[PDB]
Amino acid sequence: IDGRLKELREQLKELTKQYEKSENDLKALQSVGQIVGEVLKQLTEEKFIVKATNGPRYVVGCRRQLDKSKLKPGTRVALDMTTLTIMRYLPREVDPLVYNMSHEDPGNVSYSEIGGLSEQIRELREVIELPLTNPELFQRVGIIPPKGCLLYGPPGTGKTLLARAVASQLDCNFLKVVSSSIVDKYIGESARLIREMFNYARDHQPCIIFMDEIDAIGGRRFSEGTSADREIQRTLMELLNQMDGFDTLHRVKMIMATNRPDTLDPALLRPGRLDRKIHIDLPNEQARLDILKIHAGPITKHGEIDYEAIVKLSDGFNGADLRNVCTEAGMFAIRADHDFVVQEDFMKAVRKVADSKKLES
Amino acid sequence: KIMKSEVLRVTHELQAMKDKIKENSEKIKVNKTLPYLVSNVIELLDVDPGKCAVIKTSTRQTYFLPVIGLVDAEKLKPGDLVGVNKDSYLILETLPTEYDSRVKAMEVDERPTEQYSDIGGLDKQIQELVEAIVLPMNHKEKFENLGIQPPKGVLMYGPPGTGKTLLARACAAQTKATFLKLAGPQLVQMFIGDGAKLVRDAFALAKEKAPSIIFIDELDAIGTKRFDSEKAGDREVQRTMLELLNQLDGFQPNTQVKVIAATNRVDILDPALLRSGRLDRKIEFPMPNEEARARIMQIHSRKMNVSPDVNYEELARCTDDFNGAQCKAVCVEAGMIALRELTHEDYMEGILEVQ
Amino acid sequence: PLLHPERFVNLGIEPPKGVLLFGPPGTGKTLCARAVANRTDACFIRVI
Ligand SMILES: Nc1ncnc2c1ncn2[C@@H]1O[C@H](COP(=O)(O)OP(=O)(O)OP(=O)(O)O)[C@@H](O)[C@H]1O
Ligand SMILES: Nc1ncnc2c1ncn2[C@@H]1O[C@H](COP(=O)(O)OP(=O)(O)O)[C@@H](O)[C@H]1O
Ligand SMILES: Nc1ncnc2c1ncn2[C@@H]1O[C@H](COP(=O)(O)OP(=O)(O)O)[C@@H](O)[C@H]1O
């Protein structure tokens, strides 16, 4: 029965008809467009002064369907290419296009990809979101919303990962700004850069500024007390007095992802300061096994679910290290060119990373 | 059934409408064979009461072609160098953009031919970085089906003459993919954001040309250890370092275009470039031992047939604290003196000459 | 190398990669001119 191929022929005809309607819209337009100008002067209800962006201005008429209230003075419009009359008015935009927002809200599904310390994530969300959601109540009752929160655990669970994930309930744009990148020169005029980044947040009003490293290596080397004396602290006081950056109006918070809260200028933990600090350390056994499970999630092999034995060898390993553990298991399997990953591969990966960090420390 | 009449209409409609597509495409393509105006897309997403475009012509004018009447805004993003109708004032077709003067071809080698066999000594490290880079190029589907995204950032740290450049070019050749070399020490430009623009367009070129090898040299020069002082504090170059950092994450999906950074001392860098997704594979490049130095110079002089039966053992004894470059210089110093020494004694003076 | 009698095989691949005929204001480049005369028509240019 040739009639049963009617379905395949119908699919072919629909597929080619999409292309045919596309080409019909492409050739039916065949337009020359309209030239772009600005309303230099309205002159009168009938004649108007429209200046092209590149020289000549003309006394033209207006589009019949449009009205002067839609045209207005000093607004971008479109003139007819040949007859030189207003055809449509268009909105304009400017862009600084430099050092702008880099990380945005989409991809905020990491609320399940964090795994460890879900209670800690919940607590940080409880602290942050409500002023971020409806700050108007804070002005309405006369109370100042918090500025942000402090995060510990220098190499441990992903502080930046938490910054990304917690914005799920926030629908905000997390920004990864470095303290050194913000201070630049060692002058009090470093506040210019903070002004620029706060203006960027203001433009993208639902934003959270995630700081990279303020207490530069809080575990060792030079702290706030050593090396640059008080430069970091004064630059932070700049963002502290920024707190009057229309907290009621502006949906901007700042998370401080320090390594160690040891040298953090206790003058910056008073009320009105950063205030809230949430404790993050190296993941416990439960968080460790959970993050191991989520790391192995994308990996589908034979293996086993013997996560506790892996935890036993890999105790006190940071979340990034455990992600590296899963990647090393994959690397071992592929170096063997084996399409299977068994618990022995996990044992090899854990031993490899443990020996590596033991030698490096 | 109805199929006979249906297919009788179907073949005719398909062929005739594809002929009409050919006619329209030719009438537009000779205009696409004569595009003249640059396409500075001031993109306004005018949805019809879908999209639209503002084009800044080369002759300093603005053309507002409605709804971008030939091409799709998915492939046409706000940018430049996309064909514009000279007569119809319409977006005609995409075309390659401009790679920022210097980055058009700064030092890009189309294809390196140096082979892995002519280098050695650090064979364990070279095999490690081969597994970390070249295997993600040839057997990329292997990593894809495994589910582990290969790392990209590999940092070869070690004194000069340890063969980082040759190893990188050989790895690129083995991948048979594009190779882009960055001259790090000269990335410090007085122009504001100049290094940032160079890095941006270098990554753009690598992305546009295959899974490439971005071989950035002098990573120590690029990044300071934040040892700020009154003399200087790495104020401006921090912009470029941050630009590189932000560019490192562009190619995470489809894991392609690997980053290889060569320096001597890894410790001169802040703990910011070092990350799992960032530069992670920090590989040591030590000065070769006597055996490795002898083998390397032997391989270099393999294309020389003048003095038979030179075991280079006295050479190895006399190659104390020398690089692969120094061994090559030693062997070619013989390649310069061995006219008309010769065997086992025309090698010492090469190092003595340099100082 | 301009004679090309021996560079290919007996000595390593290519002749010495460079020559830097320096020295205080004096004999410099006169030997270059003499070599130019003694060599083929592929004769030098004095760029500054
Ligand atoms: N060995 C020499 N024999 C003869 N004349 C010489 C010799 N060395 C230099 N001169 C004379 O010196 C003058 C310039 O010589 P030459 O071309 O070598 O130098 P130059 O190009 O002027 O620069 P510089 O003196 O810095 O090397 C000429 O008049 C040349 O005759
Ligand atoms: N609990 C976790 N679950 C999943 N991934 C994690 C976790 N902790 C860390 N990581 C991994 O570590 C990487 C970076 O973590 P990072 O924010 O640098 O942690 P820290 O700041 O404590 O060093 C991320 O890519 C993330 O995938
Ligand atoms: N294993 C090797 N085999 C052959 N030549 C080598 C080797 N290692 C170094 N070289 C020589 O060293 C030179 C490269 O030096 P360079 O790339 O600056 O060293 P590094 O990469 O350590 O800075 C090349 O010309 C090459 O001849």
mmCIF file of N, CA, C and O in Angstrom, chain A residues 2 6 13 16 20 23-24 26-27 29-36 52-54 76 81 88 90-91 103 160 180-181 184 217 299 301 323 326-328 330-331 334 341 360, chain B residues 2-3 6 10 13-14 17 20-21 24 28 44 46 54 56 60-67 69-70 88-90 131 142-143 145-148 235 239 252 271 275 281-282:
data_model
loop_
_atom_site.group_PDB
_atom_site.id
_atom_site.type_symbol
_atom_site.label_atom_id
_atom_site.label_comp_id
_atom_site.label_asym_id
_atom_site.label_seq_id
_atom_site.Cartn_x
_atom_site.Cartn_y
_atom_site.Cartn_z
ATOM 1 N N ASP A 2 0.881 1.961 -1.129
ATOM 2 C CA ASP A 2 1.635 3.208 -1.212
ATOM 3 C C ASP A 2 1.019 4.281 -0.325
ATOM 4 O O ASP A 2 1.695 5.241 0.065
ATOM 5 N N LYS A 6 1.936 8.046 3.111
ATOM 6 C CA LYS A 6 1.370 9.385 3.164
ATOM 7 C C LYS A 6 1.893 10.159 4.363
ATOM 8 O O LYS A 6 2.085 11.372 4.275
ATOM 9 N N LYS A 13 6.577 17.322 3.313
ATOM 10 C CA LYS A 13 5.920 18.534 2.839
ATOM 11 C C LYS A 13 5.894 19.607 3.916
ATOM 12 O O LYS A 13 6.097 20.787 3.623
ATOM 13 N N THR A 16 9.509 21.040 4.146
ATOM 14 C CA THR A 16 9.850 21.945 3.055
ATOM 15 C C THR A 16 8.957 23.182 3.062
ATOM 16 O O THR A 16 9.363 24.244 2.582
ATOM 17 N N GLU A 20 9.728 27.083 2.793
ATOM 18 C CA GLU A 20 9.052 27.883 1.780
ATOM 19 C C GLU A 20 8.431 29.138 2.381
ATOM 20 O O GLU A 20 8.511 30.215 1.788
ATOM 21 N N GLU A 23 11.265 31.530 3.083
ATOM 22 C CA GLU A 23 11.711 32.224 1.880
ATOM 23 C C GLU A 23 10.664 33.216 1.388
ATOM 24 O O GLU A 23 11.018 34.251 0.813
ATOM 25 N N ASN A 24 9.379 32.923 1.606
ATOM 26 C CA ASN A 24 8.331 33.867 1.242
ATOM 27 C C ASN A 24 8.435 35.137 2.069
ATOM 28 O O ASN A 24 8.282 36.245 1.543
ATOM 29 N N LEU A 26 11.201 36.141 3.384
ATOM 30 C CA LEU A 26 12.487 36.752 3.058
ATOM 31 C C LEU A 26 12.412 37.566 1.774
ATOM 32 O O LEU A 26 13.020 38.637 1.673
ATOM 33 N N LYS A 27 11.668 37.075 0.782
ATOM 34 C CA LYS A 27 11.621 37.762 -0.503
ATOM 35 C C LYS A 27 10.489 38.778 -0.554
ATOM 36 O O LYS A 27 10.610 39.803 -1.235
ATOM 37 N N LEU A 29 9.548 40.742 1.796
ATOM 38 C CA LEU A 29 10.006 41.978 2.413
ATOM 39 C C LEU A 29 10.831 42.782 1.419
ATOM 40 O O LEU A 29 10.402 43.857 0.985
ATOM 41 N N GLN A 30 11.990 42.246 1.029
ATOM 42 C CA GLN A 30 12.885 42.851 0.036
ATOM 43 C C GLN A 30 12.990 44.364 0.222
ATOM 44 O O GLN A 30 13.069 45.137 -0.735
ATOM 45 N N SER A 31 12.992 44.786 1.482
ATOM 46 C CA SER A 31 12.830 46.190 1.816
ATOM 47 C C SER A 31 14.174 46.916 1.819
ATOM 48 O O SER A 31 15.243 46.316 1.953
ATOM 49 N N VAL A 32 14.105 48.236 1.663
ATOM 50 C CA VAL A 32 15.276 49.094 1.787
ATOM 51 C C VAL A 32 15.434 49.652 3.196
ATOM 52 O O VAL A 32 16.461 50.281 3.489
ATOM 53 N N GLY A 33 14.452 49.450 4.069
ATOM 54 C CA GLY A 33 14.524 49.954 5.421
ATOM 55 C C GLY A 33 14.238 51.437 5.499
ATOM 56 O O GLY A 33 13.854 52.095 4.528
ATOM 57 N N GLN A 34 14.433 51.969 6.702
ATOM 58 C CA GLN A 34 14.280 53.396 6.949
ATOM 59 C C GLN A 34 15.569 53.915 7.560
ATOM 60 O O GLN A 34 16.260 53.179 8.268
ATOM 61 N N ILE A 35 15.897 55.174 7.280
ATOM 62 C CA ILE A 35 17.117 55.751 7.827
ATOM 63 C C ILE A 35 16.850 56.188 9.260
ATOM 64 O O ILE A 35 15.705 56.468 9.635
ATOM 65 N N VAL A 36 17.899 56.231 10.073
ATOM 66 C CA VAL A 36 17.744 56.512 11.495
ATOM 67 C C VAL A 36 18.143 57.953 11.776
ATOM 68 O O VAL A 36 19.204 58.414 11.342
ATOM 69 N N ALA A 52 19.578 63.409 10.758
ATOM 70 C CA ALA A 52 20.263 62.135 10.650
ATOM 71 C C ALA A 52 21.460 62.116 11.591
ATOM 72 O O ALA A 52 21.993 63.159 11.978
ATOM 73 N N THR A 53 21.882 60.908 11.961
ATOM 74 C CA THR A 53 22.994 60.767 12.887
ATOM 75 C C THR A 53 24.311 61.256 12.301
ATOM 76 O O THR A 53 25.282 61.407 13.049
ATOM 77 N N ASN A 54 24.366 61.509 10.998
ATOM 78 C CA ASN A 54 25.610 61.807 10.300
ATOM 79 C C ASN A 54 25.452 63.030 9.406
ATOM 80 O O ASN A 54 25.753 63.001 8.212
ATOM 81 N N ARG A 76 14.780 59.000 19.198
ATOM 82 C CA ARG A 76 15.202 58.373 17.953
ATOM 83 C C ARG A 76 13.988 57.982 17.125
ATOM 84 O O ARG A 76 13.008 57.442 17.650
ATOM 85 N N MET A 81 13.491 56.462 3.425
ATOM 86 C CA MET A 81 14.774 56.572 2.741
ATOM 87 C C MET A 81 14.707 57.572 1.593
ATOM 88 O O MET A 81 15.624 58.380 1.406
ATOM 89 N N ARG A 88 8.786 55.470 11.757
ATOM 90 C CA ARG A 88 8.641 54.856 13.068
ATOM 91 C C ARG A 88 9.652 55.459 14.033
ATOM 92 O O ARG A 88 10.727 55.902 13.622
ATOM 93 N N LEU A 90 11.987 54.792 17.493
ATOM 94 C CA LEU A 90 12.668 53.657 18.091
ATOM 95 C C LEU A 90 13.356 54.061 19.385
ATOM 96 O O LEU A 90 13.880 55.173 19.496
ATOM 97 N N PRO A 91 13.366 53.179 20.379
ATOM 98 C CA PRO A 91 14.163 53.416 21.584
ATOM 99 C C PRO A 91 15.650 53.215 21.325
ATOM 100 O O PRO A 91 16.065 52.477 20.430
ATOM 101 N N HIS A 103 28.755 37.172 35.345
ATOM 102 C CA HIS A 103 27.953 36.009 35.694
ATOM 103 C C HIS A 103 26.528 36.461 35.982
ATOM 104 O O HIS A 103 26.319 37.468 36.663
ATOM 105 N N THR A 160 32.014 30.158 46.336
ATOM 106 C CA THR A 160 31.479 30.671 45.082
ATOM 107 C C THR A 160 30.316 29.817 44.599
ATOM 108 O O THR A 160 29.352 30.329 44.019
ATOM 109 N N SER A 180 41.594 42.669 45.186
ATOM 110 C CA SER A 180 42.694 43.366 44.527
ATOM 111 C C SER A 180 42.211 44.094 43.282
ATOM 112 O O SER A 180 42.607 45.240 43.030
ATOM 113 N N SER A 181 41.348 43.448 42.497
ATOM 114 C CA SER A 181 40.776 44.081 41.319
ATOM 115 C C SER A 181 39.949 45.307 41.661
ATOM 116 O O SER A 181 39.848 46.216 40.831
ATOM 117 N N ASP A 184 42.820 48.168 43.136
ATOM 118 C CA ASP A 184 43.808 48.629 42.166
ATOM 119 C C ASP A 184 44.955 49.362 42.858
ATOM 120 O O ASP A 184 45.719 48.754 43.616
ATOM 121 N N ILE A 217 44.773 34.899 51.542
ATOM 122 C CA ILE A 217 45.309 33.686 52.152
ATOM 123 C C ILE A 217 45.229 33.817 53.667
ATOM 124 O O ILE A 217 46.195 34.213 54.324
ATOM 125 N N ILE A 299 28.399 10.574 36.393
ATOM 126 C CA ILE A 299 29.149 9.388 35.997
ATOM 127 C C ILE A 299 28.231 8.177 36.110
ATOM 128 O O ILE A 299 27.736 7.857 37.191
ATOM 129 N N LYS A 301 28.523 4.313 35.427
ATOM 130 C CA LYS A 301 29.373 3.172 35.124
ATOM 131 C C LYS A 301 28.904 2.002 35.979
ATOM 132 O O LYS A 301 27.841 2.055 36.606
ATOM 133 N N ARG A 323 35.563 16.796 43.546
ATOM 134 C CA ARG A 323 35.289 16.907 42.119
ATOM 135 C C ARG A 323 36.511 16.485 41.316
ATOM 136 O O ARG A 323 36.405 15.752 40.324
ATOM 137 N N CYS A 326 36.625 12.691 41.283
ATOM 138 C CA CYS A 326 35.807 12.062 40.250
ATOM 139 C C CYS A 326 36.446 12.233 38.876
ATOM 140 O O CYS A 326 36.467 11.293 38.065
ATOM 141 N N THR A 327 36.991 13.421 38.603
ATOM 142 C CA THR A 327 37.668 13.631 37.327
ATOM 143 C C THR A 327 38.887 12.728 37.194
ATOM 144 O O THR A 327 39.188 12.242 36.102
ATOM 145 N N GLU A 328 39.604 12.494 38.293
ATOM 146 C CA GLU A 328 40.760 11.609 38.246
ATOM 147 C C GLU A 328 40.339 10.166 38.031
ATOM 148 O O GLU A 328 41.052 9.407 37.370
ATOM 149 N N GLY A 330 37.727 9.295 36.231
ATOM 150 C CA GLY A 330 37.495 9.273 34.797
ATOM 151 C C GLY A 330 38.789 9.249 34.006
ATOM 152 O O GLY A 330 38.898 8.555 32.993
ATOM 153 N N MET A 331 39.787 10.002 34.468
ATOM 154 C CA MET A 331 41.079 10.039 33.796
ATOM 155 C C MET A 331 41.764 8.681 33.840
ATOM 156 O O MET A 331 42.356 8.248 32.849
ATOM 157 N N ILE A 334 39.925 6.364 31.370
ATOM 158 C CA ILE A 334 40.224 6.676 29.977
ATOM 159 C C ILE A 334 41.680 6.404 29.623
ATOM 160 O O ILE A 334 41.969 5.995 28.492
ATOM 161 N N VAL A 341 34.063 2.049 35.007
ATOM 162 C CA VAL A 341 34.667 2.629 36.202
ATOM 163 C C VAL A 341 34.163 1.860 37.411
ATOM 164 O O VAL A 341 32.967 1.872 37.715
ATOM 165 N N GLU A 360 52.062 18.110 48.811
ATOM 166 C CA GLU A 360 52.001 19.558 48.652
ATOM 167 C C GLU A 360 51.822 20.285 49.977
ATOM 168 O O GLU A 360 52.085 21.490 50.048
ATOM 169 N N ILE B 2 -4.966 8.701 -2.309
ATOM 170 C CA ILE B 2 -4.675 10.107 -2.580
ATOM 171 C C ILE B 2 -3.189 10.353 -2.774
ATOM 172 O O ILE B 2 -2.802 11.439 -3.221
ATOM 173 N N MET B 3 -2.350 9.359 -2.473
ATOM 174 C CA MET B 3 -0.905 9.554 -2.502
ATOM 175 C C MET B 3 -0.427 9.958 -3.892
ATOM 176 O O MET B 3 0.429 10.837 -4.029
ATOM 177 N N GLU B 6 -1.270 13.399 -4.389
ATOM 178 C CA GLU B 6 -0.543 14.128 -3.359
ATOM 179 C C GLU B 6 0.934 14.247 -3.707
ATOM 180 O O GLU B 6 1.500 15.339 -3.647
ATOM 181 N N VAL B 10 3.369 17.215 -4.578
ATOM 182 C CA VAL B 10 4.468 17.407 -3.637
ATOM 183 C C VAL B 10 5.790 17.608 -4.359
ATOM 184 O O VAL B 10 6.534 18.546 -4.050
ATOM 185 N N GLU B 13 5.706 20.988 -6.207
ATOM 186 C CA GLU B 13 5.787 22.125 -5.300
ATOM 187 C C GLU B 13 7.180 22.258 -4.707
ATOM 188 O O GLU B 13 7.740 23.358 -4.671
ATOM 189 N N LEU B 14 7.766 21.145 -4.262
ATOM 190 C CA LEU B 14 9.101 21.201 -3.681
ATOM 191 C C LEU B 14 10.116 21.712 -4.692
ATOM 192 O O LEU B 14 10.877 22.641 -4.397
ATOM 193 N N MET B 17 9.385 25.457 -5.781
ATOM 194 C CA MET B 17 9.679 26.421 -4.732
ATOM 195 C C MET B 17 11.162 26.464 -4.397
ATOM 196 O O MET B 17 11.674 27.523 -4.031
ATOM 197 N N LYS B 20 12.409 28.717 -6.951
ATOM 198 C CA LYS B 20 12.142 30.094 -6.548
ATOM 199 C C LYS B 20 13.132 30.556 -5.485
ATOM 200 O O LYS B 20 13.575 31.712 -5.491
ATOM 201 N N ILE B 21 13.472 29.666 -4.550
ATOM 202 C CA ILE B 21 14.497 29.969 -3.557
ATOM 203 C C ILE B 21 15.824 30.249 -4.244
ATOM 204 O O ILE B 21 16.546 31.178 -3.876
ATOM 205 N N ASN B 24 15.556 33.814 -5.905
ATOM 206 C CA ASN B 24 15.698 34.871 -4.911
ATOM 207 C C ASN B 24 17.112 34.904 -4.349
ATOM 208 O O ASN B 24 17.690 35.980 -4.157
ATOM 209 N N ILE B 28 19.743 37.990 -4.656
ATOM 210 C CA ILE B 28 20.286 38.576 -3.436
ATOM 211 C C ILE B 28 21.778 38.286 -3.312
ATOM 212 O O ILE B 28 22.512 39.028 -2.646
ATOM 213 N N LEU B 44 18.155 46.430 18.126
ATOM 214 C CA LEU B 44 16.883 46.701 18.775
ATOM 215 C C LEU B 44 15.929 45.564 18.444
ATOM 216 O O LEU B 44 15.607 45.334 17.275
ATOM 217 N N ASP B 46 12.906 44.836 17.993
ATOM 218 C CA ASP B 46 11.578 45.338 17.641
ATOM 219 C C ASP B 46 10.722 44.151 17.211
ATOM 220 O O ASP B 46 10.815 43.636 16.096
ATOM 221 N N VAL B 54 20.079 48.109 13.427
ATOM 222 C CA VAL B 54 20.634 49.395 13.025
ATOM 223 C C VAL B 54 22.040 49.125 12.518
ATOM 224 O O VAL B 54 22.875 48.585 13.254
ATOM 225 N N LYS B 56 25.505 50.673 10.891
ATOM 226 C CA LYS B 56 26.346 51.831 10.604
ATOM 227 C C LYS B 56 27.163 51.502 9.363
ATOM 228 O O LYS B 56 28.103 50.712 9.398
ATOM 229 N N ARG B 60 29.411 56.143 6.772
ATOM 230 C CA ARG B 60 28.923 56.928 7.904
ATOM 231 C C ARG B 60 27.436 57.260 7.749
ATOM 232 O O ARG B 60 27.044 58.409 7.550
ATOM 233 N N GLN B 61 26.608 56.219 7.809
ATOM 234 C CA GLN B 61 25.163 56.393 7.775
ATOM 235 C C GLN B 61 24.502 55.280 8.576
ATOM 236 O O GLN B 61 25.142 54.301 8.951
ATOM 237 N N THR B 62 23.211 55.446 8.851
ATOM 238 C CA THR B 62 22.445 54.474 9.624
ATOM 239 C C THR B 62 21.326 53.913 8.763
ATOM 240 O O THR B 62 20.515 54.671 8.221
ATOM 241 N N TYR B 63 21.273 52.590 8.652
ATOM 242 C CA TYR B 63 20.204 51.911 7.933
ATOM 243 C C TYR B 63 19.452 51.009 8.896
ATOM 244 O O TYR B 63 20.053 50.140 9.536
ATOM 245 N N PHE B 64 18.151 51.245 9.021
ATOM 246 C CA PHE B 64 17.295 50.442 9.889
ATOM 247 C C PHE B 64 16.482 49.470 9.038
ATOM 248 O O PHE B 64 15.300 49.670 8.760
ATOM 249 N N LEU B 65 17.151 48.415 8.610
ATOM 250 C CA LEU B 65 16.460 47.365 7.880
ATOM 251 C C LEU B 65 15.470 46.677 8.812
ATOM 252 O O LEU B 65 15.839 46.292 9.928
ATOM 253 N N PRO B 66 14.212 46.517 8.406
ATOM 254 C CA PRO B 66 13.211 45.952 9.318
ATOM 255 C C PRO B 66 13.461 44.471 9.565
ATOM 256 O O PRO B 66 13.841 43.730 8.655
ATOM 257 N N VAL B 67 13.266 44.059 10.820
ATOM 258 C CA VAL B 67 13.185 42.667 11.259
ATOM 259 C C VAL B 67 14.332 41.807 10.724
ATOM 260 O O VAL B 67 14.230 40.575 10.693
ATOM 261 N N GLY B 69 15.946 41.428 7.465
ATOM 262 C CA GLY B 69 15.110 40.811 6.458
ATOM 263 C C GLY B 69 15.706 39.641 5.707
ATOM 264 O O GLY B 69 15.051 39.146 4.785
ATOM 265 N N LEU B 70 16.912 39.184 6.038
ATOM 266 C CA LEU B 70 17.443 37.990 5.391
ATOM 267 C C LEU B 70 18.078 36.972 6.327
ATOM 268 O O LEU B 70 18.018 35.775 6.023
ATOM 269 N N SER B 88 19.911 47.420 -1.191
ATOM 270 C CA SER B 88 18.720 47.155 -0.400
ATOM 271 C C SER B 88 18.884 47.530 1.066
ATOM 272 O O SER B 88 17.912 47.426 1.821
ATOM 273 N N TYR B 89 20.078 47.957 1.481
ATOM 274 C CA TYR B 89 20.316 48.435 2.843
ATOM 275 C C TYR B 89 19.859 47.406 3.875
ATOM 276 O O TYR B 89 19.256 47.746 4.895
ATOM 277 N N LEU B 90 20.143 46.139 3.602
ATOM 278 C CA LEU B 90 19.648 45.025 4.394
ATOM 279 C C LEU B 90 20.811 44.121 4.774
ATOM 280 O O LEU B 90 21.808 44.045 4.050
ATOM 281 N N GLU B 131 48.255 12.890 27.920
ATOM 282 C CA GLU B 131 46.988 12.333 28.383
ATOM 283 C C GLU B 131 46.015 13.434 28.778
ATOM 284 O O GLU B 131 44.800 13.292 28.601
ATOM 285 N N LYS B 142 35.612 10.023 23.884
ATOM 286 C CA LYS B 142 35.830 9.140 25.024
ATOM 287 C C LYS B 142 35.466 9.842 26.326
ATOM 288 O O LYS B 142 34.691 9.316 27.137
ATOM 289 N N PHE B 143 35.995 11.050 26.529
ATOM 290 C CA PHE B 143 35.622 11.837 27.699
ATOM 291 C C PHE B 143 34.137 12.168 27.683
ATOM 292 O O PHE B 143 33.484 12.174 28.733
ATOM 293 N N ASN B 145 31.560 10.435 26.469
ATOM 294 C CA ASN B 145 30.735 9.315 26.905
ATOM 295 C C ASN B 145 31.046 8.919 28.342
ATOM 296 O O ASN B 145 30.173 8.395 29.042
ATOM 297 N N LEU B 146 32.279 9.151 28.799
ATOM 298 C CA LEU B 146 32.586 8.906 30.203
ATOM 299 C C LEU B 146 31.787 9.841 31.101
ATOM 300 O O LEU B 146 31.289 9.425 32.154
ATOM 301 N N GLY B 147 31.641 11.098 30.695
ATOM 302 C CA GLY B 147 30.974 12.091 31.507
ATOM 303 C C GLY B 147 31.893 13.028 32.258
ATOM 304 O O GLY B 147 31.402 13.952 32.919
ATOM 305 N N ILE B 148 33.204 12.825 32.183
ATOM 306 C CA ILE B 148 34.169 13.710 32.822
ATOM 307 C C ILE B 148 34.683 14.709 31.797
ATOM 308 O O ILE B 148 35.263 14.332 30.773
ATOM 309 N N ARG B 235 49.323 47.032 39.075
ATOM 310 C CA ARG B 235 48.004 47.651 39.000
ATOM 311 C C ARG B 235 47.314 47.330 37.677
ATOM 312 O O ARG B 235 46.243 46.712 37.655
ATOM 313 N N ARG B 239 44.293 43.868 35.329
ATOM 314 C CA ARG B 239 43.170 43.851 34.400
ATOM 315 C C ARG B 239 43.318 42.710 33.406
ATOM 316 O O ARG B 239 42.369 41.961 33.151
ATOM 317 N N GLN B 252 34.159 25.856 28.534
ATOM 318 C CA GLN B 252 33.831 24.696 29.361
ATOM 319 C C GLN B 252 32.924 23.707 28.640
ATOM 320 O O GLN B 252 33.242 22.505 28.639
ATOM 321 N N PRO B 271 47.379 32.460 44.235
ATOM 322 C CA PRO B 271 46.508 31.278 44.213
ATOM 323 C C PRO B 271 45.127 31.577 43.652
ATOM 324 O O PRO B 271 44.114 31.187 44.239
ATOM 325 N N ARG B 275 43.204 26.524 39.877
ATOM 326 C CA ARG B 275 41.872 26.057 40.228
ATOM 327 C C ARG B 275 41.587 24.814 39.399
ATOM 328 O O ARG B 275 42.299 24.511 38.439
ATOM 329 N N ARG B 281 46.841 21.598 35.917
ATOM 330 C CA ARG B 281 47.898 20.615 35.717
ATOM 331 C C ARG B 281 49.246 21.322 35.757
ATOM 332 O O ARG B 281 49.771 21.726 34.718
ATOM 333 N N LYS B 282 49.803 21.486 36.952
ATOM 334 C CA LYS B 282 51.106 22.111 37.124
ATOM 335 C C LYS B 282 52.195 21.056 36.985
ATOM 336 O O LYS B 282 52.345 20.190 37.853
#
